[PDB]
DNA sequence: TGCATCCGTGAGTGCAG
DNA sequence: TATAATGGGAGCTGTCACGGATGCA
């Protein structure tokens, strides 16, 4: 910590002086409307009346039409979104929007697309989408009517962040109540029961096993404690050992190789500590990437860890979480 | 009241009277409003403001706030040097502003040495709406937040405010510095990832200087000898970074 | 300077009078300007006509009158009175048996009056009555959420003027009915109306589906007045069903146009709905002995034909703006009036049948008080009577045009779901879709569209030009939502030759869906784009380049614009900046043509052509509701020749008649070393120098001196134990001298109260025994100044009693008020904002030698940070700078109409023309290109901003038109590696300043029952450390820091006192005992007969009251 | 001694009486003239 | 960060046991006038006043540095409590 | 259910 | 939202805390009675001890809301939700809150049983060697 | 016995108020 | 303290979702 503290101010000092001198700015001219645009805008109306004509000659219904009217416009948006980044990376790799969204300093492709590309399909109060999209950009400028249509979207979205917030809160609170007495009360409960964390997902795409996504495996493994030995790729991971981040990455490899399918871990799903949990069944105190210290209020940490994200969970969304808890 | 039948209303209003159970229960009841968390002495609030000059473990506490939040300590120190004879006269000095003499503040700076305060920001969603800082006194009214800790707090500078609480006991200090100081809490307790990390300007800065130009002039000629490629370049026909 | 316009849209009509919804409304309820004979039965009148006449003796209503107010508008503002008129009403008593005639005009109280601008004065504070939105009276059908094929019908009157009723056709064939949630077969009711089996099939006769199911002759075997008693049993389980009591209960619910009123609206809506004329606003009639139905069968007709499939039977959209409607201020108060009147009528008839049935007049049969009180109520504790928002003049105007869904009559917050808040199709051009608050009230409180008006029925309607053939008429008509839906309506800006639709594709709406249609098919055309948005929203230049969610912040944030002492209108305007200063009725204009006689910081007198010599006095330095100096300044000079409607003084936040919400500043958009971080803002010290973003503020500090059961409180200059230095600014009496400087600690008004039965105790009687002064009998209760407040005493008001004109609340001798002022420079912490939603706190004020600056020596004023723009998506502030660049060097301001403004070419044109001034000035004044401008140009070329191989002038030209310039860091002279966006921005100082919000307490007040610290800056609060903060400490495991919070810092009275003694003694704080609030928890469970008990580990009790509650 | 548990249970009529320091006999608060507590009412000091 | 923290957490079996050892030692000092310190004058934490450098007052900074030396003993059930709260009021008075 | 109508 | 599985488990584990009886063997329990999985496992040992029959039980899954309300500590439950229903049933049964958890001790205001307050660490002593040997030598001879 | 149906209970933080 | 007088009066309305206890083919 002590050094990472000094490391951190360091990256703070230089990163900050640099931003200023290097001379990043934003002028209207910096939302570059890729010329690929009207190729894609024109290519659309033709394929639109190419389905206003498999209905104009009554070929198939309105409930079929609207459906393919916005399967078109969605994969149109995708095209010109790409065109906005190809046009950036190949020709202005240092233009400020590109730079900002790219490093992770601000923006993401979808907003940026509305500065340069087109705004997209908008929502109708009900929940259905207007088949008429707003073709304008924000650089280009919206027609009054375009602007209005676009408003049902945001109002319905504000309302949402307001009712939602009240349930996250309420939810968070139930979570604290049902776990507050959980503390890391003892060192080992001697429990001889554990859990298999599957590295493989019983698919139905191939309904074979597909390896599980890295971060989701990190999620079930980082900072655990083995409850049996493991021997994979000439390495010996012992009973008792706290999987360090690298311990994890090695186990994925060995799984990619076929030597392992599910790590046996000491989880709190099974500590026999009364009114708390042992150190072993817990694992690392993630705030310190090291074994948890007896007396951490891990229940409260849990509750906080799970509540704090729901705000911030857009549908199902947070509902489905509440349906489960 | 109101549990069964109509509720007991004073005359000329429709406000149910507040019965014994109504006191005990509800978000406004005795439990959730006075037992699971009270108001507190030694605490302040103010508008925050980025201070990029701070070290990770620091913050900008305006000095008018400082005085009050430490007022006892400042009365005792004010004696041990002698900007007043006894503590009671010491207090009457600071009660009108004029009467504050310069070496009052020098006196304060002794007071708060070493000890930290707490910053709290609006929704304490997780263990980190509260973190510990050594205050550095400043003029002006605003609190100075360190930029790296803005993320945990979800604190921008659209005019957010923050709470200050002074720990008191030698225990409440030793808790704040060891366990709750910012510089010690750098990894998230939820994912174990880092949480004091670079964000907006800080990475914008380091990106810009570690990126690399990719020039389009030379278009990738095939020159068999350096000595002429250079020549080509001092000819102006091939840009410096073209591959 | 020149004011270049853009915009091709010739707007036909202008904005209508922007407070008409407040003023037109109240006046159409008072009629205090109509000869009573000529009045008409709406508003204050209609209420009289409704409650009168009173019945057995009888007392009938002749006419009312209204007298002018006993004190003029300003006199009530000072003396904390109400601006109200006396209400007289002439009556005539007449005896139900003999022919008695007496006639007095009895006095009913005071009705408060509305000022010129739309406000009210109520105990001397201006207030606004927010019109309320509610579902409107009428009859509706909406499908049953359970049975996908059966449909509830509902019948709804005005609020509290009748019951709701549903006609859900049950799963047992025969149709139901709900009243006070009491269901029963509809049939029983039709009977009571004199209905016959046959004349049902004679009217239904089509849907043997249920027409034949509706009929069940366990009912038909009865005459009309037979089921009349049948059903009185169904709704009164217990009351004796006498044929005098049942005709009274039904009637008093369904045919009594005295507690059942459909709207005047409700009539027409149910009329056109069921296509039947309607005698009166009432479901049933009593006429010729029995009941004659009016509304039940028509409603029953619709519902049936719908549940089969008939045409022309659509469910209704209760969120349509034809089925919602506005209870304007006048209607809202006559409601409260119609409830005071009805209470007075419980008070006459009571004294009409007890006390003497012949020696009686109107004068003494009427107790005015039930009326006086319901009026005092409406204006002093309604949800809809809000403290006025006179921060700046826009705030007062935006307020008057607010629309709450909430309040008495509408929605409880919990009752508010989604459909209420959504932007509805029919909002288009009636309610703004932007202007609404973020937070829990989102979509309930909204704003009136700018061209929109409320018709006499309470619906909002918006204007439209009529197109015939394809030519567009100058004849405008305002439609309700409902009729709009009948037409195809072209877009504001569909392009025209002269007045013919010049395109072949026209952009039009048909019932709010967008349709592409030929000019043959086009019936109406929007008047303007200004007609779709709030006033405030119409103040946002370049709105069409601004994502909606920040347009909204730039909209609201304006009403928070503190008025600045050097305020200026925005260099880039939208065209409303002038009307707003007008209808805001805060600036001051010319009544007729004339010449100007005198002029002065205090008054402006003008000779007119009429010879009249008007003398407009100047509201100079008046304290607004929100503390913001409401200051009127003069804009003419002696003898100036003034045509009509010209200006004579600028109101606050108005410059030569334009809404000056803030200042125009030279802004650079570039990270600056961390002081930009997360919307923070860096400013040039050169701003405080020229007094930019400075504002004047005032706080009232009031004190009373009252008669006591221990003596009188005394306003004296004679305060015990206080040094003359500590009084050197107080007059003989104990008032600070007007013009002093007062700071925290300073006495503003000395005062003395008498000490108690703790008159000096022994400890104290001795300390004085040594000092030669004996115990003094009075006490210093002087009004000091609060921590972090102060300024320059500008006035004082001293009201005793025993002086003329004055009489205060009982037992109070004298009340002294001292108004204090401050000149508020901008300082580090205050909030700045622009009209696009860029908001941030001043985080740093560099001295001018550090500001980025242009080659020609000029330093910027504001360094905003570009990281604000991308994720925020509000590009307008980008354009607003570029066109601000041009303006800065041409010396021009611009008017860019919303959605019809200056576009990119038109503006890059203006930048060229500026470049000439900025650089051509140069290469002649003896200087060429600069060595750093090349190094930057070198870079610009790698970027792609400039065409390589062109004269530097050519390239700098090219950068300019991209709104970018070379910038030298003032800390080095070296140039910014890049070319920066630099321009001219409109940026307001918001109301939220560090000065008003820094606060801290060591220890202070506590609460009576809890002994936990009080809360709030003004009480000298403590900070609430909540459940969520406790969790925080819990997760850290700071047991001792948390415990501290829960004992010595809050309410552990023992260890709290013990601690503060420990600090001032230099000792560590002591381990704590039980919080006092827990004791309250014990005692409060005893009072509920529960025996809570602290116990030690060996199970024997433990007294946490140290024996003080055992015997 | 030191608290270690907290028991909650019904108060018998005789127990309610155990706690009490006097039957509040009158529905009176405090004397409209001396602003002091009427005896035998809700604020009486002998109770 | 706190100077030397990373090694502090190394000594104790659980971070919270450091916190109380620090806070306890750090109050042993506040009451005794520091006479019992196990430092030497040049290791003495020192703050800088407007007049001149002086002994650091913050008994907690002391206690932490104090702990790094290794000159202190920590652990459960090592003394009678009353035989320390006097033998230390003996070796160094109040 | 309603304490007046009862006494009535 | 990267978030460690162990947190969600901690909670879920509390949803699973409880069990329904399905034959009381030789005990005072009753078919249908609910109780903590802990407390049944507890006495099913005292019953495999006195060698009599064991309680037949059955796993119970409760949502979080109902699981907080069913906690032992009535001080925790009354301070959460459904305050009377909690409060009465407790007083009838003359429940005693053991003060085992956090809320409990927060309402009383005592040092919570976590962090610096865990019994594992709160009784720790610290003595300077210049005082650990000063008291060890007078106390080596009576 | 299974399943309507009613009644009672909840519905985020702090700050200004 | 004495003609006679003998059953009230306002409801309020647009949320929601879950869990438990009661009524009914
Ligand atoms: N009822 C409220 C209102 C505000 N907030 C807090 C939460 C956030 O701290 C901030 C809301 O986030 P914002 O929308 O203001 O903007 P962000 O800075 O969080 O995201 P971005 O950087 O894109 O603007 O205010 C909250 O928790 N609850
Ligand atoms: Mg913020
Ligand atoms: Na932000
Ligand atoms: Zn275990």
From TrEMBL, chain E:
Entry's transmembrane regions: none
Molecular-function GO terms, alphabetical: DNA binding; DNA-directed RNA polymerase activity
Coiled coil: none
Record Pfam families: RNA_pol_Rpb6
Gene assigned in the entry: rpoZ
Name of the protein: DNA-directed RNA polymerase subunit omega
Enzyme class at the top of the EC tree: transferase
Subunit: The RNAP catalytic core consists of 2 alpha, 1 beta, 1 beta' and 1 omega subunit. When a sigma factor is associated with the core the holoenzyme is formed, which can initiate transcription.
Keyword match GTP-binding: no
Keyword Transferase assigned: yes
This protein's UniProt keywords: DNA-directed RNA polymerase, Nucleotidyltransferase, Transcription, Transferase
Matching HAMAP family: RNApol_bact_RpoZ (MF_00366)
InterPro entries: DNA-dir_RNA_pol_omega, Pol_omega/Rpo6/RPB6, RPB6/omega-like_sf
EC number assigned by the record: 2.7.7.6
Family in the record: Belongs to the RNA polymerase subunit omega family.
SMART domains in the record: RNA_pol_Rpb6
